[PDB]
């Protein structure tokens, strides 16, 4: 629930000097009558900050949060309320929300869906977010609060820490020196890259009083701090020919899968990463993006032809006839399987009987094992000596190929790449 505003006036931003602003305690330690140097994100002297004025005038822009921000605001009658910190300001990311109503101060981080124009409006209207469903961190804190009031705020996000700095003192930006003690340390541990402010509008309707605030940037610079006896701060100063195995006219049998070993080269996966015809890139264990970074000491290649059903069934979580009696994947597999359609070839006028596969086996098959299916199979009590009987026969079967099958009922050219870990030095690392 948000209300769009179309009365905004566009003016160029103004700039204000930053002579003696942007100084705080480097740490919780206390030092007196000694000069100490620290390396931390401060605000260098004679820097440039941007002048924002509120008076209708409702300048509420959005600026990126590259580094720490120094917030200086001359304040009267409680105009500003808080700030929004977030990356994209939607439900897809986690964003902060700081509001200080008439009772207390609550700090809540959720998946707030900020509208185009979030603001606040006695105060009984809070149009900041729609809803949230999955968020846990919620915090409640003590209330932190002619113009006569000035506030300084410095926000830093280092090592997943959100430190807020507050200082209240009476009074264009005045020239002077003041301390800035830490108040609350909160370990939010979230990514922040953009920020925006909040403006409160008072109905009569939606009127904003004379208020101004400054936004500054922080840079790493060494500073010198001088103390005294009272304990206060006074002043500051050889490639593998993969085309042979990826463009061969003929492959081996399904049950008699060819065994090949090619090494002593570099792994140029970008050559086949951009290929057009293949559409399957299933991988387990190692991500494809990292695959061009780490070093593998073993490279194995397999050459066989089979339809996409076995390509989907190659996962160890499911079984099958081929997946149990012909070829199965080990449980600790870390490789990948690549398959592509080859309907343009391997389809003659008649059927092709050059590819055969096993059907029956007594028990399971150990992975990466060579087995020859040439003996007779027996099922009854009386075995046969090669006789094609009722219970005794040959498990092997032929194939039938036609150009009028279904969407996925076509043979695919399947190549299997497996990666193994061993103490032996790697022969292929590039």
């Amino acid at each position: 629930q948000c209300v769009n505003l179309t009365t905004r006036t566009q003016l160029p931003p103004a700039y204000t000097n930053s002579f003696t602003r942007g100084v705080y305690y480097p740490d919780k330690v206390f030092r007196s009558s000694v000069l100490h140097s620290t390396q931390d994100l401060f605000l260098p002297f004679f820097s440039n900050v941007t002048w924002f004025h509120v008076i209708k005038r409702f300048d509420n822009p959005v600026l990126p949060f590259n580094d720490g921000v120094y917030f200086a605001s001359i304040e009267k009658s409680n105009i500003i309320r808080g700030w929004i910190f977030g990356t994209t300001l939607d439900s897809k990311t986690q964003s902060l929300l700081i509001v200080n109503n008439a009772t207390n101060v609550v700090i809540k981080v959720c998946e707030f869906q900020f509208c185009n124009d979030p603001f606040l409006d006695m105060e009984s209207e809070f149009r900041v977010y729609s809803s949230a469903n999955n968020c846990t961190f919620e915090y409640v804190s003590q209330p932190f609060l002619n113009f006569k009031n000035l506030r300084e705020f410095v926000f830093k996000n280092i090592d997943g820490y959100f430190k807020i700095y507050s200082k209240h003192t009476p009074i264009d930006l005045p020239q002077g020196f003041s301390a800035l003690e830490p108040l609350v340390d909160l370990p939010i541990g979230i990514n922040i890259t953009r920020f925006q402010t909040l403006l409160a509008l008072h109905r009569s309707g939606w009127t904003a009083g004379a208020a101004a605030y400054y936004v500054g940037y922080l840079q790493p610079r060494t500073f010198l701090l001088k103390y005294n006896e009272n304990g206060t701060i006074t002043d500051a100063v050889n490639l593998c020919p993969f085309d042979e195995v990826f463009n061969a006219t003929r492959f081996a049998s399904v049950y008699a899968w060819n065994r090949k070993r090619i090494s002593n080269c570099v792994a140029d996966y970008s050559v086949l990463y951009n290929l057009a015809p293949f559409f399957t890139f299933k991988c387990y264990g190692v991500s494809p993006t990292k695959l061009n970074d780490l070093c593998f000491t073993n490279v194995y290649a397999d050459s066989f032809v089979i339809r996409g059903d076995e390509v989907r069934q190659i996962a160890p979580g499911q079984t099958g006839n081929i997946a149990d009696y012909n070829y199965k994947l080990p449980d600790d597999f870390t490789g990948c399987v690549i398959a592509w359609n080859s309907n343009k070839l391997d389809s003659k006028v008649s059927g092709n009987y050059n590819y055969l596969y096993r059907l029956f086996r007594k028990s399971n098959l150990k992975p990466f094992e060579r087995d020859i299916s040439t003996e007779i199979y027996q099922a009854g009590n009386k075995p046969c000596n090669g006789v094609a009987g009722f219970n005794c026969y040959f498990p092997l079967r032929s194939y039938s190929f036609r150009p009028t099958y279904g969407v996925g009922h076509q043979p695919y050219r399947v190549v299997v790449l497996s990666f193994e870990l061993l103490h032996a030095p790697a022969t292929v690392c590039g």
Partner: antibody, heavy 115, light 107 residues
Framework: EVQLVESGGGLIQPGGSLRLSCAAS????????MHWVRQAPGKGLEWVSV???????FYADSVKGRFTISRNNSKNTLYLQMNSLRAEDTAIYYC??????????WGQGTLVTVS | DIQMTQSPSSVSASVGDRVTITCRAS??????LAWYQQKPGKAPQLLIY???TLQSGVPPRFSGSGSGTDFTLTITSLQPEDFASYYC??????????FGGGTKVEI
């Protein structure tokens, strides 16, 4: 020269446990696939359950759960067990054996009714 | 994903006639079709397998011809003994056989 026998029919309440027996004659169930098929009155055959020659069983989408098959090689008898049944699940059941892509062996059946 | 259907449902013909019973498949199955008989109150029997060959013991009456989609069973003479139903069996890579409706032949 091949025959099959079945036992286990009777009166079973809906959502109950029933055990079926299928003793192969002349064939060993540990070396060949087991097949189950139903013939409803006024309807046709469709998938029921098929046990592999190893220690694995295949089920369809509707019968993925609630089914547990543990064959015994001591007496060469196929065992079928389910824990829940509906009002539309009663028909004649046949245990069967066959080769790849077609089934040959058949037999009689046991009838069970629910109410 | 896959379903079998049969356009004929009940065809009556004499002994010297052709039933012309076929099974319709959405996608193409290559020579993996078998036809069975369902006798009311009796055990089923084998007729053919793979739609090209003949099972041993089956009398030479039931035949078939079709590459991927158009399969038609041909009977030279309709004997009075084999008056049962017809079912078409097709399977994918795994042994997931699919069956359609039944066609009844009456005198």
């Amino acid at each position: 020269e091949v025959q099959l026998v079945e036992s286990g029919g009777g009166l079973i309440q809906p959502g109950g446990s029933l055990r079926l027996s299928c003793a192969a004659s002349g064939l060993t169930v540990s070396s060949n696939y087991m097949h189950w098929v139903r013939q409803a009155p006024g309807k046709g055959l469709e998938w029921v359950s098929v046990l592999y020659a190893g220690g694995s069983a295949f089920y369809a989408d509707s019968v993925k759960g609630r089914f547990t098959i543990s064959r015994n090689n001591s007496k060469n008898t196929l065992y079928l067990q389910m824990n829940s049944l509906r009002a539309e699940d009663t028909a004649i059941y046949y245990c069967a054996r066959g080769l790849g892509d077609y089934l040959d062996s058949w037999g009689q059946g046991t009838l069970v009714t629910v109410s | 994903d896959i379903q079998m259907t049969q356009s004929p449902s009940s065809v009556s013909a004499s002994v010297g006639d052709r039933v012309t019973i076929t099974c319709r498949a959405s996608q193409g199955i290559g020579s993996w079709l078998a036809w069975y008989q369902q006798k009311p109150g009796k055990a089923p029997q084998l007729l053919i397998y793979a739609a090209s060959t003949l099972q041993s013991g089956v009398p030479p009456r039931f035949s078939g011809s079709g590459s991927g989609t158009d399969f038609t069973l041909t009977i030279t003479s309709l004997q009075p003994e084999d008056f049962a139903s017809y079912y078409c069996q097709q399977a994918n890579s795994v042994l997931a056989l699919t069956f359609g409706g039944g066609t009844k032949v009456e005198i």
